[PDB]
Amino acid sequence: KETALSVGAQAGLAWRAKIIDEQLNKQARNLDAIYDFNSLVLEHNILPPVLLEGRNTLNLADAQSIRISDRTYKVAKQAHFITTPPTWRQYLWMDYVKPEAPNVTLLPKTKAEKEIWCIYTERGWKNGIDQANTILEENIARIKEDFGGMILYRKLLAMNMVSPPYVSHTDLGVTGDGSEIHIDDRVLRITALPELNVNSAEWRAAVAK
């Protein structure tokens, strides 16, 4: 009967994963339409870093110890190079291997055994559906956080809060021994990671109309 519960969990999870994968495939153009990292790739093919923010922070350390702040910011992932832009399929695709091996050990002989077998399979079906939904929600939250981080980086870049990444390049002529040759050795190097400015008087505000 516990075996019936477990195979109900596995079969329901597999079925829901297949349905949610094809449903994700149904709207494929809109996903890469909205999650265009290629618009946000910087000029030296470097992924912009990730920033997180918070508002109205209060902490009670212990008795008689209260520390509050208005807003805060935190660098999550440092900027680095990327050969290719990322995509949503690195975040949202579900694994699917349907298991089809229920061993013939206990099979319901009484009608009561058949009915409790049915309801145990049904409970496993519900549980697998719930697990698949939670996994999907987790992935959606992750990709939402990263996209918000990149757009926040561009936001406070416009607000003049981050130093933009300064990168040099050394250019050489041909090189190699008498046997092997190169043409134009150009080596690129970022010597200045982006970071927040703390001299707040240089901050630039905004207005609307």
Binding site: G173, V174, I183, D184
Partner: protein, 105 residues
């Protein structure tokens, strides 16, 4: 992207325009990846033009690379100018049929 893009007016464009003399209207299939001086001199000799230079080559000369099959030599010189950019200039005189290579300092 519209409000962030930066362009130039065509009146202030620093590109080589087409000289359209009659000797420049041929086809050539050239692949090259190296220096500049022999390339432009040999282009001028294929065009039956004289050729001269002013300035000086630096310690590391400018390296260029062009591959094409069927395109005019005037367009070859246009792409040479576009690959060179700022440190090197190229002039064509069709009155006295010469080409001139200009360095920067």
């Amino acid at each position: 992207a519209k409000v962030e893009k930066v362009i130039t007016p065509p009146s202030k464009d620093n590109t080589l325009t087409i000289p359209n003399a009659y000797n420049l209207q041929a086809r050539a299939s050239v692949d090259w990846s190296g220096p500049i001086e022999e390339l432009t001199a040999r282009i001028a000799k294929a065009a039956h033009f004289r050729f001269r230079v002013l300035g000086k080559s630096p310690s590391v000369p400018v390296l260029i690379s062009i591959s094409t099959k069927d395109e005019s030599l005037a367009e070859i010189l246009r792409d040479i100018d576009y690959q060179a950019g700022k440190k090197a200039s190229i002039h064509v005189y069709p009155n006295s049929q010469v080409v001139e290579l200009r360095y920067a300092k």
